Design a protein around this nucleic acid. Sequence first.
RNA 1: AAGCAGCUUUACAGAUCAAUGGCGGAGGGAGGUCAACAUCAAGAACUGUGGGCCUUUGCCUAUAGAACUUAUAACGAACAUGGUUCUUGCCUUUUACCAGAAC
RNA 2: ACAAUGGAUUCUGGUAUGUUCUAGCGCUUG
Lengths: 48, 27, 96, 19, 49, 157
Amino acid sequence: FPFNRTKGKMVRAQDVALAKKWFLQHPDEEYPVKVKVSYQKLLKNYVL
Amino acid sequence: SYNGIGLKSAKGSSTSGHVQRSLASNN
Amino acid sequence: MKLIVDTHVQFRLGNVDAFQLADGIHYILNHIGQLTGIYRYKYKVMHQIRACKDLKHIIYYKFNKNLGKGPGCGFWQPAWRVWLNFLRGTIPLLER
Amino acid sequence: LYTPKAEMPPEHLRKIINT
Amino acid sequence: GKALNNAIPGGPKFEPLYPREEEEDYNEFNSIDRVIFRVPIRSEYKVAF
Amino acid sequence: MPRIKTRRSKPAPDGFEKIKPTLTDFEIQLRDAQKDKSSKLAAKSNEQLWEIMQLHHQRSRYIYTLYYKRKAISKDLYDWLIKEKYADKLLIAKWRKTGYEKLCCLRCIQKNETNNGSTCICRVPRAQLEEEARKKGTQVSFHQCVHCGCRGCASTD
RNA sequence: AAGCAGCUUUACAGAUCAAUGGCGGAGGGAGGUCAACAUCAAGAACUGUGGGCCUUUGCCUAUAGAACUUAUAACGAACAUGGUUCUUGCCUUUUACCAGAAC
RNA sequence: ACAAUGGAUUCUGGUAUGUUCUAGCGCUUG
Ligand SMILES: O=P(O)(O)O[C@H]1[C@H](OP(=O)(O)O)[C@@H](OP(=O)(O)O)[C@H](OP(=O)(O)O)[C@@H](OP(=O)(O)O)[C@H]1OP(=O)(O)O
Ligand SMILES: [Mg+2]
Ligand SMILES: [Zn+2]
Ligand SMILES: [Zn+2]
Ligand SMILES: [Zn+2]
C-alpha cells in the first residue's frame, strides 16, 4: 500500500509516515550501535 | 536474545543492561 | 515558530538556497533542545526531542550512504511530524 | 438563510496589522 | 515480548508487565532431576508459541 | 494561481499589455493605502480601511466592464485575472445578479454579520430612506456604512 | 458471433390519427479546504411492515431495505496530551519528572 | 561459534518586610 491501488481518499501531510517502514524492518548487521538503538527506540513508541 | 539472562529492566538498575556472553565458559 | 518562519524569509530574500532552506528546517527540528529551551517548562518534550534525535540517525545513515560527513541533509518530513503531534497535545494544555 | 464567508481582500488584513 | 518480559533481538525493551515475579512455590515440579535438557528454550520459542 | 509571480504561475495572455497601465494604478494606490498612516481617531482609522474596500471594488469593476459589459478582453485573459487574484470572483458573481448590480461588497449582504438577520443599510434604496425620514420629520441619518463606507449600493440609484 | 426469423428500440412512410396500452415527462447538471442536523464500536451487532401470544412491553412468525466503520478487528494504513489510582525510577521539598498498569 | 548499550532540566536561595513622602488655596466665621 498504496502503490497497489489506483484510487483512494486523501490523507494529510501529517499522516504520510515516510520513515515508519524503516524501523519496522530489521536494520542490518552493518549499522553501528548508536543507530541500532534508534531503531529499537522508535519501535518502542510504535508498540505503545 | 533474552534467554533467561539479564534484567527485567534497566530503569532501576543504574546500569545499561548490556549482556554479553562469557567467552571463557565454553566447555 | 519564528525560527522556522525566519528561514523561509531568508530563502525568499535570496540569501539562502533552497537546499539550505531544507537543511535549515531540518537543523531546527532536530536541535530544538539547544535552540529553544522548551524542556525547562514542559519536560515531557524530551520524548519529542529524543524522537527527533532517533529519527536523525535513521535519516542520516540512509542519506549519507557513499557520501561524506557534511551538513546538507534536508529530509525534514519525519521530524516535522513529531512537533506537529507535540502541538496536537499541548493545545488543550495551554488553552486551560 | 446561510451565505458563506465573504472573502476579504489581502490588503484589508494588512492595513489592520500595520495600524 | 512486552507481556512475557522477553527481548526480541531487534525489538524493543519494556518494563515488566507483571513485576511481581519473584514469588515462587517450593515444589518438585520444575526441578533439575525432573527436566530433560535437549534444546534450550529460546526467547523466540516463547514468543512464537 | 498565486499573487506572486512564481514559476508555477502561468504567463499572461495576449490582451494583458493593453490593460496593464490601468491595473498598475490600482496597485500603487493599494500600496499607498496600506502605508500605516498613524491616526489617533477611530473615525479616521476605519475611513482608511474604507479606502481599501473602494479600491478593491473599483479594480474589480474595471475587469467586470472589460469582459462582461464591453467584451474587450478574451475569456482566457479573464480567467487568468481571476486565478492571479486581479479580480474578485465572488463579488463579480453578484454583479451578474439582478438585485445586486452595483453591489457595495460581499460583506454588506451577509445576514449573519448583523444583529438582525439583515443586510447593510447601504443596500437600501435612498428614496426609501428619504421616505421613512420624511414621516419622522428629520433628515436621513445614514451617511456611510461601517463596513466599507458605502453610500448606497442599490441598483436603482 | 456473419447471415435469416423472433424481440427491443430507432430516423421514420404509416394504420389508427378515437377509446387506448407501454416507457419517459408534471421546476436541471457539475461542483465548494461551504454550513447545519443526524449518525459512526455492538448478543456479528440494523430498521421499516404484516400476522399471532400474553396484557403497551416482550416473544414468535412472514417480508422489505441496509450508507459508512471492522477480523493480524476500527472512523485516522495516522498518532499527541491531561486527570485519578496502583506500582516503580530520579533523591534537597514542591512543580516539572522516570516508566509500566487500570479506569 | 557472540551480534543484547539506562541516563540527560527548570523553578522555589538575608535584607526580607513595613511606614511617610499636599505642588496647584472650595465662598462663611476666624
Ligand atoms: O560527531 P559524530 O559522532 O561523528 O556525529 C555527528 C554529529 O551528530 P552525533 O554526534 O549526534 O552523532 C553531528 O551533529 P551535531 O551534534 O554536530 O549537531 C551530525 O550532523 P549535524 O551537526 O548536522 O547534526 C553528524 O552527521 P553528518 O556528519 O553525517 O551530517 C554526525 O556525524 P555521523 O555521520 O558520524 O553521525
Ligand atoms: Mg516548606
Ligand atoms: Zn454599500
Ligand atoms: Zn460594503
Ligand atoms: Zn454597507
